[PDB]
Amino acid sequence: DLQEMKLVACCLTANSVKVLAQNLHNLIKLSILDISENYLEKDGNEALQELIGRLGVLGELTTLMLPWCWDVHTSLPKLLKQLEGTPGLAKLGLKNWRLRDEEIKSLGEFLEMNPLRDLQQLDLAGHCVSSDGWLYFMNVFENLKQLVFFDFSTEEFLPDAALVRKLSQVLSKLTLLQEVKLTGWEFDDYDISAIKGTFKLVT
Amino acid sequence: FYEPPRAVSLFFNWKQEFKTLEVTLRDINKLNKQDIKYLGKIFSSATNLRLHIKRCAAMAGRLSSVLRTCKNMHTLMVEASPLTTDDEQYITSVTGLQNLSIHRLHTQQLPGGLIDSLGNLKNLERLILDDIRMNEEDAKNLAEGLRSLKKMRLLHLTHLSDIGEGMDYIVKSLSEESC
């Protein structure tokens, strides 16, 4: 009858994710999944892709919280490919994936081909997407309408004013802004004083 | 723009779909990083940018440094300011530049600059040349740059010296196809 399984800051192995990806087919109602804030030493690509290939069998999973490991943006098109096989998701948390422009435009073709607006909380931690991929990321985020609580924190990145102004236009445009987290950023006087609305900012 | 946080505040409250902005640059002598970054970040308010150089002394080598963020640019005018070769390579580096003016160049046009990498401005339509110090071979390779760009509609070659028999190469470059 398990429907929520939440594990963070725990010493997971590729054997744990492996056997989880070998006997996860028996568990059916487990619709809420947190394995984030963890690290996989070896075969995190392999046990991740086998894991999501097991996750295609499921039909209730709406909450996914995913950790950080090595060589992962080859697993991004297969995660997003099984989410092209999955027309339903509501909670997405993605920790420290170090993504770039190609992965965020793969997500761009994903959301511009699959309309998924049941999603309410979103984490995109620790990535080195360039400023034009931040702008196109405001085109992809411009496509969204129903995101509620999210976190776009990354490393110490200086944004451009085009990113700031699309952030004011689209963040002012969307409705359900409860709490927004951006940590590791530079917004000095005008940029920090030109955003504020119905959300709750976290530096 | 004479000789400015208030206009930085003015564009930096709301941003909408401005079509085009015209920038009048007048006599830039002092040059601190705060005005570089502020006046740099203003320029993304419109969909097209019309930059006007007017006798700016501090921008003798700071062309590419300030405009590095400024991806949006439509046309540019050069009015009586010093300029380097690599800055001309920054002029030819951008592709969205469609119309260009240049006036009062006292110094000799160095090779490897504007006239040597001329064939990169693939949407050039209006080109204005006045008071340029060159020689014959610079006009020849200039005309070799004229053989590349095939979308021009308007050309000015006013007030030019040391151009003996370069006009055969220039007019030869222009009268090739029905342009």
Swiss-Prot record, chain B:
Free-text tissue specificity from the UniProt record: Expressed by intestinal mononuclear phagocytes.
Positions annotated as LRR repeat: 15-38, 94-117, 121-144, 146-171
PTM info: Phosphorylation is essential for NLRC4 inflammasome function to promote caspase-1 activation and pyroptosis.
Highest taxon, organism lineage: Eukaryota
Localization: Cytoplasm, Cytosol; Inflammasome
Phenotype of gene-disrupted mutants: Mice show defects in inflammasome function in response to S.typhimurium (Salmonella) infection. Differences are however observed depending on the strain background: in a C57BL/6J strain background, no striking differences are observed compared to wild-type mice following Salmonella infection. While in a BALB/c strain background, mice are highly susceptible to orogastric but not intraperitoneal infection with Salmonella: enhanced lethality is preceded by impaired expression of endothelial adhesion molecules, lower neutrophil recruitment and poor intestinal pathogen clearance.
Role played: Key component of inflammasomes that indirectly senses specific proteins from pathogenic bacteria and fungi and responds by assembling an inflammasome complex that promotes caspase-1 activation, cytokine production and macrophage pyroptosis. The NLRC4 inflammasome is activated as part of the innate immune response to a range of intracellular bacteria.
Record note on domains: In an autoinhibited form the C-terminal leucine-rich repeat (LRR) domain is positioned to sterically occlude one side of the NBD domain and consequently sequester NLRC4 in a monomeric state. An ADP-mediated interaction between the NBD and the WHD also contributes to the autoinhibition.
The protein's assembly and partners: Homooligomer; homooligomerizes following activation of Naip proteins by pathogenic proteins such as S.typhimurium (Salmonella) flagellin or PrgJ. Component of the NLRC4 inflammasome, at least composed of NLRC4, caspase-1 (CASP1) and some NAIP protein (Naip, Naip2 or Naip5). Interacts with Naip5 and Naip6; following Naip5 and Naip6 engagement by Salmonella flagellin. Interacts with Naip2; following Naip2 engagement by Salmonella PrgJ. The inflammasome is a huge complex that contains multiple copies of NLRC4 and a single Naip protein chain.
Protein name (Swiss-Prot/TrEMBL): NLR family CARD domain-containing protein 4
The species this protein was found in: Mus musculus
Segment of the intact protein contained: 616 to 820 of 1024
